[PDB]
Structures are given as structure tokens and as C-alpha cells.
Subunit: 261 residues, 4 copies
């Protein structure tokens, strides 16, 4: 079928890409980076993230694969020494697919802008103090003062979510997790402190109190949005699909990355 390969652009990744294309030429496989059904990422998790966002249009028509030419990654989880075996079973088709949930971020102005995130989306202030009211399913939950907030996908919990004390979540759980960044807690102000895990269809809304300008990140991308009226988080109806050629459990992936490998 159709396929494309993105590369980190260093020496080993470009050469591994050319070898897989050459190997792909020995099968009923066509290179098309416009409407591929198999996107192969070569490099790191950042290379995978760029591949994911490049094709966020046709998510339900693509199965992704990540190859790590550096250290092990949670998305680029196949060693380069596995490329030739990868080439063959991709071309013979008839492989299993696994799907991970995604996080929808809606930004509303005084207009609307929506975004899809594979790792997480964060909100910080444009320089001054960051104060927002946190509204869960239309109920006002808390007034947050601090550096910012982070809403994470399940598979995103091993990234920035982990650095803020959030929990690690198996990606088969359709959920999103919200964590705090350096929150102020005293006798006047109060935050929950604990990370919060939300199921499907629960809507978390951030609403400004004074400053209406926020630095909003979605995975690697980060833009200052002006005159923001609301930020809305919820588990996405869309999922990312992976090609599954071997058993590599999420908890083993977590172990190899943090305990020992």
C-alpha cells in the first residue's frame, strides 16, 4: 500500500530511511507522503510527534510505526536492527493494530481554535501571574494560582505529566490527567494539589480571572494566544492507530526507560 518515512535528519536516520525504501521497493509498496496508510518515523519520540501532527488529518486511515536510532522511546520503540524484519511484515500486511486515546483542546476567543495532542497540552501565563478558574462539567472546582496546568493523554503520562508528579496510566484507559505547576496554597487560596484523572465525556474548562493572554502548548508547539475567553479539555473521539508486529507491553516500555535497560 501507500507509505512514507520521516527521519530526524542526522546521518544514521537518513541512511536507515533509504535502506527501508530500497527494501520496500522489493514489494507491492508505493511511496506517497500525501495519502499514505503507513507512516514510519525514524529518530526519537519527537520525530514521531512531528509525524503524528503532519498527518492529523487522516488519523483513522494511518497506522504509525516508530524506530529509535537513539535511546529507547515510548513511541519510537523498535530498534534499528529490526528495520529489515519490519519492512517484510509491513508489506505482507495482515498485522494487528492498537489504538491510543488523544486529548482535544478547544480555545475560544472574543472565534474558536481546536487542537489534537498526543502527549499533553499546557497553559501558562504570558509573563504576569497565572490565575484561572477551573470548571469541571460546568461546576466551578477551584481557582488556580501558580505557574500553570498540564492536561495529559494516557501515553503522555510518561512525559511532562511524570515530571510534575502525575501518575503513569496504561494507554488502554480512555482518560486524561490534569496536573498542577508550582501552585500557591495558603489561607486565602486553595488548590486540590493532587493530580486529577478524568474519564471520557468529562469537560474541564479553564477561564481567566484577570489576564486574558496565555501561553498554550500542544505537544512541541507553543503559541501565545491573545484575548482568550476559555480553554476546554476533553478526551478526543479520535484515536491514533499503531501497527503491532510484536508484544512490547507498556509497563515493560516504562521499565526499560526508567528502572533499567
Amino acid at each position: 500500500m501507500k507509505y512514507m518515512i520521516t527521519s530526524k535528519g542526522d546521518e544514521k536516520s537518513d541512511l536507515l530511511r533509504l535502506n527501508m525504501i530500497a527494501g520496500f521497493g522489493e514489494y507491492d509498496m508505493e511511496y506517497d507522503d500525501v495519502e499514505p496508510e503507513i507512516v514510519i518515523s525514524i529518530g526519537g519520540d519527537g520525530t514521531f510527534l512531528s509525524a503524528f501532527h503532519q498527518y492529523e488529518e487522516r488519523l483513522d486511515e494511518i497506522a504509525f510505526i516508530g524506530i529509535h536510532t537513539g535511546h529507547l522511546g515510548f513511541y519510537a520503540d523498535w530498534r534499528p536492527a529490526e528495520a529489515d524484519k519490519l519492512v517484510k511484515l509491513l508489506a505482507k500486511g495482515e498485522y494487528q493494530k492498537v489504538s491510543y486515546p488523544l486529548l482535544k483542546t478547544t480555545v475560544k476567543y472574543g472565534k474558536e481554535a481546536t487542537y489534537l495532542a498526543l502527549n499533553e497540552s499546557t497553559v501558562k501565563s504570558s509573563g504576569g501571574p497565572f490565575v484561572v478558574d477551573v470548571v469541571i462539567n460546568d461546576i466551578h472546582f477551584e481557582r488556580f494560582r501558580g505557574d500553570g496546568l498540564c492536561m495529559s493523554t494516557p501515553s503522555g503520562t510518561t512525559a511532562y505529566n511524570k515530571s510534575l508528579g502525575g501518575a503513569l496510566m496504561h494507554p488502554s484507559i480512555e482518560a486524561m490527567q490534569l496536573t498542577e505547576m508550582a501552585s500557591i496554597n495558603n489561607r486565602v487560596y486553595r488548590t486540590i494539589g493532587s493530580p486529577l484523572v478524568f474519564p471520557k465525556h468529562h469537560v474541564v474548562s479553564l477561564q481567566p480571572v484577570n489576564d486574558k493572554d496565555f501561553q498554550i502548548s500542544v505537544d512541541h508547539l507553543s503559541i501565545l494566544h491573545r484575548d482568550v475567553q476559555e480553554i476546554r479539555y476533553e478526551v478526543s473521539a479520535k484515536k491514533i492507530h499503531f501497527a503491532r508486529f510484536r508484544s512490547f507491553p507498556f509497563w515493560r516500555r516504562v521499565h526499560d526507560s526508567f528502572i533499567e535497560d
Copy 2:
């Protein structure tokens, strides 16, 4: 139908219990504490927990209700001023039920003992050092040294789980969460640190390294088990069912208990 009422045993709880029984006498309602289908708890969450464990036999035949005569609780979430309205709609039946997941704990010796937990189950050492190997779905994940571990139900995440830095989890998520107690982390030993959230059918197994005696707690109950070979945690196939007479969202319950009420 059949029903029973348990009470904390102070003055207000006993008197509120006698008033509800008297109010119940005005309907087609029979007091039976052997095979009730409605268990009403009056007191605190601890009173509710005792009620839950008293009838862990016929869980799929009981709808629980908690009334708090003290501060608000996550299970005893109906004010005493609501007892008379509670009496009427319980007797007229035709109410909605909601179900929360439970945590199964299997203890194996050199024999087997299983337990059901509504909040959490914890493991500590019998005095000396606590060292266990943590095995997730037969894969060895880590060797834990510290004070102990805690596996929490979703609704249990607001209790002991919360005090250890775990995340708060909406009880509609069929999951369990494992947290660490004062873990040793150095150049020799390594723990994940982060709390871990497990879905249904994932089995977490604790296995001793040297000391085979552990203090194991299940909700309020705590017993020293001797010559333990394995502790096994997994989300239970059984659920606890609540009678639902009004909208009281879990996040509002969390807000009222920790932010302000």
C-alpha cells in the same frame, strides 16, 4: 423490601436510626439485617465501610446509602436533614443505581486468602525492612525498598492514596492505583516513584525477597500474615451498588471535602 440500618452508636446516629425505622414502618418495608436489599449507614465513611464489609457476601443484591451525622464523607454523602425524604423514595422504590469498582487482594502461603477492598489495601513489613519484587502481568517491574505500598480503588483515591501523592480518579474508571510509601532511591536501588494506574485484568504481584512476614491492611482491617509467598492485586469482578436519589457529582464531592464547603 428488606432493609437494615447500621449506626455509629453515638446519640444522634442512634436516634436518627430509630426515626428512619419508625418512618419506614409507614410503608411496605421490612427490617431484616440477614438478607436486606437496602443497607443504610448512619455516621461517617468508617461506618459505611463496616456496613460494606458486613455484607460483602450479597453485594450484587444490595444498594447502599450513607448518611453523615458528622462532616461530609465520600460514601456518607447525605445530610441528616434528608432522612425523611430518603425514607419515602426508598420505600416507593423505582430509583437509580450506580456502581463503583472494587479491588481484589489474593494472599498465598506455603493455602490462599482473598479479600475485597472498597478503599485500598496496603502492605508493610512486620518490623524489619520492607523489600518486595513488583511483578506486573508476570513481568518483573522493580524491586521496592521502603515503608510499604498501597493499591487503591477509584473511590479510594480520596483516602490514603491521596495522602501519598496519588491521583484522584473518577469512580466510573474501572482501575486500581498503586502508590509508594517512603521509597529508598539511590545508585543501587531504583523505584518508579510515580503512582501507577492499572486497568481491568492487569495483575500486580508482590513477592518477598528476604522477610516473608508482612502487615497487610484491607480498608480498616489489618492483620500480620506469616510466611507469605505472594500478594496479588487486580480490579475485582464485583462492584458495589449505590442507591442514587439525587445528582451529587464526584468532583463536587471532592470540592466540598478539600477546597471549601
Copy 3:
């Protein structure tokens, strides 16, 4: 003697300032905001911080006093209802002085810039990743990857230091405390995680690895420094002196602000 009064600029603070000046006119007291020996701050801790930095020149010639017209502050710790009693004992002189330590921050380029901080000084990246090597007393201690670092004075430990998990430190301890912001810890990278408390004469040096542009804050002030070669932290030889008219222990001040008042 000479004195000046700074005000937050709202209605109550300006009026309380004019009342104290009028009360001061009944004594041997001269208003001079160029070479005062008593600086009175009216407003919040932020008002006090501006007063401190306005006169960082003649620190060993000034005794500061803070009055809070809002909530209680750690520097503005005298209620407005105490202004008239404040006026009298300030003019009669013969009061006790107490001194708190300060933090010296040296910035070196490819030139040198030094700063004094009453609360803390923080370092973040100019947008990209923040990576620095941490050098303690010329010994390379760690390579830090994360959002940033924070070095706090003793009295500064109740501010930003507290929000990052640092310890609260009695201001009679001549020390500085370094805390981490959302550090990445895996199998490749390693940080201490724990906050570190440094005594007098211990020099902590931050050195860039790739990006040489950092956003450096000193109390309220925050500037992007370009082509930074080194950031150097150490306990200052200068101290800030307070006028002491009553017993108000630091731990009571901490209690009133965080537990209950």
C-alpha cells in the same frame, strides 16, 4: 531621624501613609526619601520588596518596617491599626534590630552583573530546553534538565521555594536553598530531586550546555540575559535589617499564613 514611606497606591495605603507622616510631624522626624534611615512599607510583601530594592544601596544604614493593608504578609507583618503606636516608638528611637540573610547572584557574559535578592532568584530557558550543569564549590554535581531552578533565601522559603516542595527555614540560619522545577529523570539523565540547603561560603554555579540564553528572575524583576557564561549563587555578605517593636516569631508568622488565622 530621616525616614520615608512607600505605599501600594490604593485608597487605604495612601491615606494610612498621610496619617503616619502627619503623626511623624509631631516628633523630631524628617521626611527624606534620598538618605532615610527608616523605610516604612505600606501594602503587601510586594510593596516591601520594591522598598527593599529601591534602597539596596544603603542597606546597612536602614531599618525596614512593613505594614499590611491587605492580608498578613511575611514582611508586611504589622496591622494598620498599629500605625499610631508604630509612629511613637519609631520616633522615640531606642528599638531593637533584627537581620535576615540575602542571596547574591552573579551573572557573567562573554562583563559581570551582580544582584541582591530578598526572596529568591530563578533561572529558566529563553524558550527552548533548559539544560545546565550544576557545579558546587568547583565540583560538578549534576546535569539538570527541566523547567528551571530556584535559589531561595531563608525568609524566601515561604514564597516560590515553598511551592516547589522546598523546606521552610528559620531566617536566623545563614543559608540558601536550591529547588528543582519539573526535572526530567530517566535512565539517561539524573538529578538529585531533593532540595539542597547550602551554608555560607558555598558557591553554586550554573553553566550552560547548549542554549546560552536564560530568563533570570531576581524577586519580582525578570530579564532575559543573552550569551550567559555562568550564573553564581552564594549567601550574601550583606543583610537586611528590620526594626523590631514586638515579638512576632517566624513560626507564628508561618502558622498565621498557612494553618489558620
Copy 4:
């Protein structure tokens, strides 16, 4: 002078001890374990702790030395390959001494019992709930509910203190640090959460609310004390003295143990 050597009792430690005694026989050195002025510990930090408590009587008459036959320790910080060079410079005398602060723990009943701790002292409940009022310098600071509390010496901050989120403190700072274990924080109850660092002469007193039986630990030793009226912590007037034969900075010791070695 007089000296003694304690050993962990395995094969290498006993043999290294006999070699040092034999090496000591070639100098003006006498083995006396009753009134030694040089106590040499061979094994781990636990071996050192037993040596410290064995001679807590004549602390101001002893210089301690620790040799690690296992991994590096914060007190047993000299490799076994250094024993013969150790023997010579110990016998030639004329070495430098360094001193670390200690923590005094006073227990009062309805009688008095005092203890000296090199690492830390902890308080937990005898089984039921642990509730104590925390009194700082006679001022009531907080009512603590949780698993327990831990007061740590400076050098003790790398042990249990570190596992609870406390800060690492250079041992030249005459201080003590108090940390919380799994504290309950809600709308009814309030703890500071943050670790607290206390200077010399600040007295921290724990006072029971209901249960008057506590499990109190002092370094390795742990005893259930009955009918406790008060627990009192303060920096000790006594210090432990080390023999200093080389530069081994505390921060390098911290680095080697937690970052890499």
C-alpha cells in the same frame, strides 16, 4: 593511643579488622574497647551507627572513622584499599577533626528518658491513628494527623529524611529538620506539608491528643513507649567528631551516592 575496631561480622570485614590490628601493632597503639579515643567502624553506615551508640558516653573523647566493605556510605566513606594508609596516619596522630551536630530527643511520662540520634528520630502510633499537637517554642503550630513525623540531623538528611521529601542539608549547619509522613489534609484538618528546618535552641514538642502510646525510633532502635506525655526535639549540645585524613566533601559524597559513581 587507645583504639578499638568494630566489624559487620562477615568475612571481609573481620579479616580487614584483623589486618588493621596487626598493622596497628607496629606503632605506639593500644587496643582498648572500654576507653578508646579512636573508634574505627568496618562495614556499612549501620555498622557505624552501632559504633556511635556503643560509645555515646565519651563522645567528646573519640574521633570516629568509617570504612565501607560494601557500597559507599555517608559515614563509612573510606574504601578498604585505604586501610593500610589509614593505619599509619592514625598512629602518627596529628590529624584534623570535623564535627557534626546531633539531635536530642526527650521523652516524658506520667519520669524522663533522653536519647541522642545521629540520623533521625521518628514517631508513629502504636496501631491506631496517630494524632499529635505540634508545639514550637511553646507556640501551638499545628495538629498533625497521619502516619508519623521524622526529625532529622543534618547528616541524617540523606537517609529517611530524604525518602520523605525533606531537603539535603550540609552538616556544618547546626540544625534539625522535621518532615511529615502521609499527612491527612482536608477542610477540617491542616498541616504545613512543607518540611521545617529548625536552628539551635528551638524546641519542637509533640503532645498527644487521644492515644498516648507511640512507637518512637532513634536511628536503628525502635521502642513502644507507653503513657507518653511529651516528646521534645532540639539540636544537641554534643557533637560527634570525625578523624579527617583527606578532603571528601559532603556534596561529593551526596553525588557519588545518588547521581553516579
